[PDB]
Amino acid sequence: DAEMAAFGEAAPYLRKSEKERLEAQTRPFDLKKDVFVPDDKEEFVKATILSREGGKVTAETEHGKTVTVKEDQVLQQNPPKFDKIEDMAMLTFLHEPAVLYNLKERYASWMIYTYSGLFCVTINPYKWLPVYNAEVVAAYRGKKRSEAPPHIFSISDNAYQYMLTDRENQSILITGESGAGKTVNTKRVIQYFAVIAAIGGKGTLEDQIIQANPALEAFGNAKTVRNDNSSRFGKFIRIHFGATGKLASADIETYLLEKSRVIFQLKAERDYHIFYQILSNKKPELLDMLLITNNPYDYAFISQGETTVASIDDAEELMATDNAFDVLGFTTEEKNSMYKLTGAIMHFGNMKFKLKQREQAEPDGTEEADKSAYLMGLNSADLLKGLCHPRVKVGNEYVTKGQNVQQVVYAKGALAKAVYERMFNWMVTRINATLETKQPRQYFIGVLDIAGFEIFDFNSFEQLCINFTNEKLQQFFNHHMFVLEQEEYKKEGIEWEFIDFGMDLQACIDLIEKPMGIMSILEEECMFPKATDMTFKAKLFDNHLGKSSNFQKPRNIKGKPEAHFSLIHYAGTVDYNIIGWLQKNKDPLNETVVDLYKKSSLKMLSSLFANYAGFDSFQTVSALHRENLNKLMTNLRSTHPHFVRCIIPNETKSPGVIDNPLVMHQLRCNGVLEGIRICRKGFPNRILYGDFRQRYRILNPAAIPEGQFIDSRKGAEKLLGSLDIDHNQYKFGHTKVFFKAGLLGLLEEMRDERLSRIITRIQAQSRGVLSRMEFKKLLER
Amino acid sequence: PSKIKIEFTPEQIEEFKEAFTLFDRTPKCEMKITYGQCGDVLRALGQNPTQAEVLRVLGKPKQEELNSKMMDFDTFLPMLQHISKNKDTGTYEDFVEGLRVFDKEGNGTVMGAELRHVLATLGEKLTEDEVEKLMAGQEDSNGCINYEAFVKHIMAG
Numbered sequence A: 001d002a003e004m005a006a007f008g009e010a011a012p013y014l015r016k017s018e019k020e021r022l023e024a025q026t027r028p029f030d031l032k033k034d035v036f037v038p039d040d041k042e043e044f045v046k047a048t049i050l051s052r053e054g055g056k057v058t059a060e061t062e063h064g065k066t067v068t069v070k071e072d073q074v075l076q077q078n079p080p081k082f083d084k085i086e087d088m089a090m091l092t093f094l095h096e097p098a099v100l101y102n103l104k105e106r107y108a109s110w111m112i113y114t115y116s117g118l119f120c121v122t123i124n125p126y127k128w129l130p131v132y133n134a135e136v137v138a139a140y141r142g143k144k145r146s147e148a149p150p151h152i153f154s155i156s157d158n159a160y161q162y163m164l165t166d167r168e169n170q171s172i173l174i175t176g177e178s179g180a181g182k183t184v185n186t187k188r189v190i191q192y193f194a195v196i197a198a199i200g201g202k203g204t205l206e207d208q209i210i211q212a213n214p215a216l217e218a219f220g221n222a223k224t225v226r227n228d229n230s231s232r233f234g235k236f237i238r239i240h241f242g243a244t245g246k247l248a249s250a251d252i253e254t255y256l257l258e259k260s261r262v263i264f265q266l267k268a269e270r271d272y273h274i275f276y277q278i279l280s281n282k283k284p285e286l287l288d289m290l291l292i293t294n295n296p297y298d299y300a301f302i303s304q305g306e307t308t309v310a311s312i313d314d315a316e317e318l319m320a321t322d323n324a325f326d327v328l329g330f331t332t333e334e335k336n337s338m339y340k341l342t343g344a345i346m347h348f349g350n351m352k353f354k355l356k357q358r359e360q361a362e363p364d365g366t367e368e369a370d371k372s373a374y375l376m377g378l379n380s381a382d383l384l385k386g387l388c389h390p391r392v393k394v395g396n397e398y399v400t401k402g403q404n405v406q407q408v409v410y411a412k413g414a415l416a417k418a419v420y421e422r423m424f425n426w427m428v429t430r431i432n433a434t435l436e437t438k439q440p441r442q443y444f445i446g447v448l449d450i451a452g453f454e455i456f457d458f459n460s461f462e463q464l465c466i467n468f469t470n471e472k473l474q475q476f477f478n479h480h481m482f483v484l485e486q487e488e489y490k491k492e493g494i495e496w497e498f499i500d501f502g503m504d505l506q507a508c509i510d511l512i513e514k515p516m517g518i519m520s521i522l523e524e525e526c527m528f529p530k531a532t533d534m535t536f537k538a539k540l541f542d543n544h545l546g547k548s549s550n551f552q553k554p555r556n557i558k559g560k561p562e563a564h565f566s567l568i569h570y571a572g573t574v575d576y577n578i579i580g581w582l583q584k585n586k587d588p589l590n591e592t593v594v595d596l597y598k599k600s601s602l603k604m605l606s607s608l609f610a611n612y613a614g615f616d617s618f619q620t621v622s623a624l625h626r627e628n629l630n631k632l633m634t635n636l637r638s639t640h641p642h643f644v645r646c647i648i649p650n651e652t653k654s655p656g657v658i659d660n661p662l663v664m665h666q667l668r669c670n671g672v673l674e675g676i677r678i679c680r681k682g683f684p685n686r687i688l689y690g691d692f693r694q695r696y697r698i699l700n701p702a703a704i705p706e707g708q709f710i711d712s713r714k715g716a717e718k719l720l721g722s723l724d725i726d727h728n729q730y731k732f733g734h735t736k737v738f739f740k741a742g743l744l745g746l747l748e749e750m751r752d753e754r755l756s757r758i759i760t761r762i763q764a765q766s767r768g769v770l771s772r773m774e775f776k777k778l779l780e781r
Numbered sequence B: 001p002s003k004i005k006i007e008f009t010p011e012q013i014e015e016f017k018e019a020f021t022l023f024d025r026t027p028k029c030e031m032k033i034t035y036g037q038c039g040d041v042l043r044a045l046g047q048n049p050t051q052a053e054v055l056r057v058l059g060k061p062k063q064e065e066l067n068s069k070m071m072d073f074d075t076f077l078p079m080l081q082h083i084s085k086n087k088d089t090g091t092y093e094d095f096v097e098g099l100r101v102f103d104k105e106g107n108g109t110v111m112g113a114e115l116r117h118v119l120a121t122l123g124e125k126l127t128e129d130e131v132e133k134l135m136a137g138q139e140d141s142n143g144c145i146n147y148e149a150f151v152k153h154i155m156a157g
């Protein structure tokens, strides 16, 4: 083990042993013969070249099947020294099969993290590996990329290291398709800082940050086809630190919750976890309090899709949720208010309406309305009277409006989504309140966990908002990696050839957010009351079919749901259904009922609606979503980003199984190869001359003598020139020193070492001093 | 590696032999120092070797060998001759740079408590007693150290 001892039982899952390493460096390999050839099914296969005649190479696959291919097709394998490499930017041959096979080989050894130059790649193991313990947290603490294997704990430390050195806010941007591992890794970044904090409401700040996610997930996460624990809202967690790097505070900002789910489920999905956790009957008292049965099929709002998930123990999860609230210091009144309002939502959908004999709705019984009103601190009669006959102002008096059954049914649904969404926002504000300390803040490390890219058989407004964010984040990566990076080289006068990596999604983003775009057309249509779903569809088509390359006709299939257009997103073409986007965007509420909510006897409910106002105000869902997303993006622009790219291996949640075309599609649309190329071809690290002189004068003070003013650039030139480094690895800019990949790391190894030698030679002289004092005493007597 | 040429004058050897008697803790004055005493003798004679460099001349001794093993002047002299043959002990500018790593603000002053902790935890750990005795009245009104002054101080004597 040696260097790998600090990790313990985790070491074989992070870095292979020297004994395993040398066994690989003796394996059979012929530079000329051993290659990679494409495959129509499995993307690329390893092969040994038998012969070639007429620019058509013949070879045998790893499955033992002979085949002949052209020129471009044949790609060089990397020698056995590169087997399961920790940073792929260090491979001799960098192409698609080299990246894919290095990931496949590592994944096969349960090594899920791999560096890709300045960023990191992770493949979902669909298995819990002994690599996230406190012993590992301590092992990664302070380590440089060289002395530590790839891991989310490593990304976390490196982000903390740049925070203290540069005295600058950092961000961890975890990307991926729904099911990839974003939430998993977000919670590990939080674990890292919380465990480190525990070393040198009810629980401590560290226990509270850890418990924040089990609480929000009960309400904001649900089982969808691609993920049993899908995030139905996006979040940004800022972990605040003091000047000395001590954990100070933390805060959570959440984004657009999938309100639709509360009252609606597609064939293969569930409502929010909380409903089923409560129904588990682990805490029977909750069912008695909520006046509910233990059967989800008795609750129409939640029983449309599935009600149980194999991977999910709702009884164990309810305990997790209830305890999270205890740790975050929620009162019994606060906890029960959330439970009673969840039950009230469950009863709301069981409220049935019928037509008055000879076009107005009236209640079809009151039992569920009585139960709902009891829990919500309302008078059931006022609520039913308020749903059927809402009051509308006639200047200096009040006139009641009529409502048919469909209108009342729509209203009770809308009010249920409103109570739920508002109760979620209450819980985030409440958590933030516990997480806010009196302690001083200098900087933060913000973690971004968005709702991942999804494609269902039915895609609506919900999916456009979700996928739009993924597009916007992918373009944040593109802009940072390929645009700013190269503009920096030119800006600093570094000799550079601009490279078009073909990573630009502005076209698509513009089709969505820019004026006359999908969202703009929707927001404009919300203004007209005569407007319908078809008038909106008509406007979209007029303005974009055959005009915006990314907007296409829907690619409808027999039996599969109707779609109105198809949008070519970065991660794939999605067929959208525009039915009900106008109601979705305006989100109108029966204000007479919202008034009874304000006058509620349940302290919690009145608080949720006290502030209430909203229109088509004149602020829409899409308008507010675009606004919050741009606020996020510009705030992220003022942070040092660190990207974690989560790859989903297969569509069957199978551990250790890679689907070659699926892994490949992800590596392509993420631009993993392009991102490795810019690290290799460019200068990934750079430092201002003043900061360089400061930090590395220690390496050789004689190059920068203390007497005179030495021009900061001539100081950097003479200092680096004096060192035992490759003098081709650095270039001089107008304000900064540019370093080719790996030079900064070596400069840091040299610095760490030299610093320890100085300490010891200082201590050696201290020892000489203390001893010569005692010798003077000997000379006295 | 006890096969070293002695390039010390007959004068030098007598002056060292004179300091050597002072460390002679033997009852019968058999002119022998322990292996543990060796480091303190090298230091008394002008050298400032590292714990490691001393153990190198002592042929990597055992714990109760440092306390029990005896050495005459003739076995000590080559050790001093070898130790003196290292002059890469660190320049003033190197030491200042080493301590300047802890000057978080670059004002030329490091917090007294910080320098103490550094000397007691990093490199070859110094004892709380060694750092107390060494940091004796070195701190200003604010309880911090001018590391350029501390370096000049330890370098002289």
Ligand SMILES: Nc1ncnc2c1ncn2[C@@H]1O[C@H](COP(=O)(O)OP(=O)(O)O)[C@@H](O)[C@H]1O
Binding pocket: A112, A124, A125, A126, A127, A128, A129, A176, A177, A178, A179, A180, A181, A182, A183, A184, A185, A227, A228, A229, A230, A231, A452, A646
């Ligand atoms: N590093 C990991 N270790 C173990 N299981 C993981 C890991 N990453 C993901 N998973 C599995 O994948 C599931 C979905 O992960 P998740 O992080 O919620 O995806 P998303 O990117 O959509 O938020 C988890 O419930 C877990 O079973």
Ligand SMILES: CC(C)n1c(=O)cc(N[C@@H](C)c2ccccc2)[nH]c1=O
Binding pocket: A161, A162, A165, A166, A640, A684, A685, A686, A687, A691, A695, A744, A748
């Ligand atoms: C990402 C890159 C542009 N970069 C660097 O290449 C160096 C930075 N700062 C220097 C001072 C540093 C050196 C050693 C450890 C941390 C920070 N900041 C940086 O942001």
Ligand code: BEF
Binding pocket: A176, A177, A178, A179, A180, A182, A183, A226, A227, A229, A230, A231, A232, A450, A451, A452, A453
């Ligand atoms: F399904 Be993951 F939460 F994006």
Ligand SMILES: [Mg+2]
Binding pocket: A182, A183, A184, A229, A230, A231, A449, A450, A451, A452
């Ligand atoms: Mg998630």
